[PDB]
Amino acid sequence: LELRLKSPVGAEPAVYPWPLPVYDKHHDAAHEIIETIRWVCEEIPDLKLAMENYVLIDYDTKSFESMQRLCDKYNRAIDSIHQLWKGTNTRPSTGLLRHILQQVYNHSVTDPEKLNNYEPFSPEVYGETSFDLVAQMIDEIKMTDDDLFVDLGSGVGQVVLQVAAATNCKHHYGVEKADIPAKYAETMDREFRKWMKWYGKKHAEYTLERGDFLSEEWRERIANTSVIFVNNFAFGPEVDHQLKERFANMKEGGRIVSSKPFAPLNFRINSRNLSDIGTIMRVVELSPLKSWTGKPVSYYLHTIDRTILENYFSSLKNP
Ligand SMILES: CCC#CCN(c1ccc2nccc(N)c2c1)c1c(Cl)cccc1Cl
Ligand SMILES: N[C@@H]1CCCN(c2ncnc3[nH]ccc23)C1
C-alpha cells in the first residue's frame, strides 16, 4: 500500500506509504501531494492542459482509492507530456521554493519535539516569517559567484538551502554545534538534493556541517567569508565577545546579517571606544516595512569598513 508521483523531468518517482504521514494537527502528506501536483501543473502549461479538471476538486484525502486515482490522473498526464516532448536546469520560483523547503522539512524532521526549540526562530515555524525575511535579505544583499556564504549556527540548514537555491555564491556553508539539529540537517541535505532533482531545479553548491564556529579551524574560515548570516538573538556575552574577535579578521566589504546588531546603529568613534567593533563596521537596520504585509520585523546589515578608524586617526593628524 503506497502512492507514487512521477517526476516531471524523469527522475526517480516520489513514493509515499499508505496510511499517509501526518505532519501536525492541520497538515499532512495528502495536502503535500495535492500541492506538489498543483505546483508541477502551474510550472508546466502542457500538463495543466492534458490533466482532467475535477481530479483536483473531487478528492478524499482519507480514501486510498480516491488518492490513488488522483496520483494516477497526474501520472498519466506526465506520461502524455513525455510522449508529446518525445515528438520534438533553472532556479525554482519563490513560490515553488517555499513549497520545496516545507516538503524537505516534513520528510526530514519527523520528531520536532527533539529540537527543544520554543523560540520564533525555531525550524518548526520557518515558513511563517523567516522564509519571507530570508527572501527579502537575498534581494537586498545581491551576492555573486565571488561570494562565500556562511550561516553560523545553521540549525537544520533551512537558511543555507534557501540561499543556495536562490543565489550563485561560489559555496554556501552551514555550521551547527548541537547534535540533534546537525543530525536532522544530514537528512535535510539528502531530501533537498532528491526533491530538487525530482522537480528538475538547479541550486548552488552547499555543505551543512557539524562544528563549533568558535574553534581554531573556524577563525580563518570566518576571516575568508564574504557574507556571514547569524541568528545571534540568544547569544550570551562570551559567545558575542568571541564572535566580534572573529569578525575583526574579516576583509573590507565583508558583510554580516544578523537578528541583533553587533555594534550600535548610532556609533560615534571617540578616544574612549577605539577598541569597539563599531570602529571597523558600518551598521544599518533593514526592515521590509521601510509591499510587506507580514510581521513588523527587522534584521541588521554590518559592512566591514576600516576607513571609519582610519578617518578618526587622519582627523587627529589633520585638525
Ligand atoms: C533563524 C532562521 C531565520 C531567519 C530570518 N531572519 C530573521 C530576523 C528577525 C526575525 N524576527 C522575528 C521573527 C523571525 N522569524 C525573524 C527572522 C534573519 C535574517 Cl533575514 C538575517 C539574519 C539573521 C536572521 Cl535570524
Ligand atoms: N544550536 C546552537 C545554539 C548556540 C549557537 N550555535 C552554535 N553553533 C555552532 N557553533 C557555535 N559556537 C558557539 C555557539 C554555536 C547553534
Side-chain angles (χ1 to χ4, degrees), residues 25-36:
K25 192 187 181 178
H26 309 102
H27 300 88
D28 59 33
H31 303 111
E32 178 190 302
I33 288 162
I34 290 148
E35 289 166 25
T36 297

Side-chain angles (χ1 to χ4, degrees), residues 193-201 203-210:
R193 293 183 198 273
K194 173 195 82 174
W195 281 106
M196 290 289 279
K197 282 179 199 132
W198 187 96
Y199 290 98
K201 304 292 155 173
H203 59 81
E205 284 176 72
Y206 71 86
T207 304
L208 291 177
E209 38 187 287
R210 190 184 173 159

Side-chain angles (χ1 to χ4, degrees), residues 218-247:
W218 270 94
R219 275 184 196 274
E220 206 196 327
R221 298 185 64 182
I222 290 158
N224 294 318
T225 300
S226 68
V227 183
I228 292 275
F229 178 107
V230 56
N231 171 23
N232 63 319
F233 212 88
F235 289 3
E238 201 50 53
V239 166
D240 174 73
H241 176 79
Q242 285 308 311
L243 201 53
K244 291 176 177 159
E245 179 181 316
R246 309 309 190 267
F247 295 159

Side-chain angles (χ1 to χ4, degrees), residues 260-267 269-289 291-319:
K260 284 187 177 170
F262 284 101
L265 285 173
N266 65 340
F267 186 79
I269 190 162
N270 56 58
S271 69
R272 286 147 275 124
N273 60 20
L274 291 177
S275 65
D276 296 353
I277 198 93
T279 66
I280 62 154
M281 58 172 54
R282 303 281 176 179
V283 195
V284 75
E285 180 175 354
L286 299 169
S287 171
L289 280 179
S291 183
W292 183 269
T293 69
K295 285 187 184 287
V297 297
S298 281
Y299 72 94
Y300 301 85
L301 170 67
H302 314 70
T303 311
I304 303 294
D305 181 10
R306 291 183 180 86
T307 73
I308 294 155
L309 187 63
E310 190 266 341
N311 296 350
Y312 172 81
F313 282 87
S314 67
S315 153
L316 292 183
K317 300 165 180 171
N318 291 72

Side-chain angles (χ1 to χ4, degrees), residues 103-113 115-118 120-178 181-182 184-201 203-243:
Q103 173 170 56
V104 167
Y105 175 88
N106 287 146
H107 284 249
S108 305
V109 187
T110 55
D111 198 355
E113 284 265 49
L115 289 168
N116 197 51
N117 200 318
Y118 293 83
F121 301 104
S122 172
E124 308 159 84
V125 297
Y126 186 83
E128 182 190 287
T129 298
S130 297
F131 178 94
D132 289 325
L133 204 59
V134 170
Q136 186 61 62
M137 186 276 297
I138 287 156
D139 294 331
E140 297 189 280
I141 72 163
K142 298 160 201 94
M143 297 172 263
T144 70
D145 61 302
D146 294 311
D147 287 300
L148 288 169
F149 179 93
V150 175
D151 178 359
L152 301 179
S154 54
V156 303
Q158 292 156 315
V159 173
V160 175
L161 299 182
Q162 191 174 342
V163 180
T167 86
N168 76 327
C169 287
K170 199 191 291 149
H171 211 97
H172 300 77
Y173 297 91
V175 60
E176 176 54 52
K177 181 174 79 167
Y184 273 139
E186 300 178 24
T187 308
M188 292 285 294
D189 175 21
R190 275 186 262 122
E191 285 286 331
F192 179 80
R193 293 183 198 273
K194 173 195 82 174
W195 281 106
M196 290 289 279
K197 282 179 199 132
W198 187 96
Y199 290 98
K201 304 292 155 173
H203 59 81
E205 284 176 72
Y206 71 86
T207 304
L208 291 177
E209 38 187 287
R210 190 184 173 159
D212 190 322
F213 59 67
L214 297 178
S215 74
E216 285 311 296
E217 180 230 344
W218 270 94
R219 275 184 196 274
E220 206 196 327
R221 298 185 64 182
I222 290 158
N224 294 318
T225 300
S226 68
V227 183
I228 292 275
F229 178 107
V230 56
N231 171 23
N232 63 319
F233 212 88
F235 289 3
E238 201 50 53
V239 166
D240 174 73
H241 176 79
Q242 285 308 311
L243 201 53

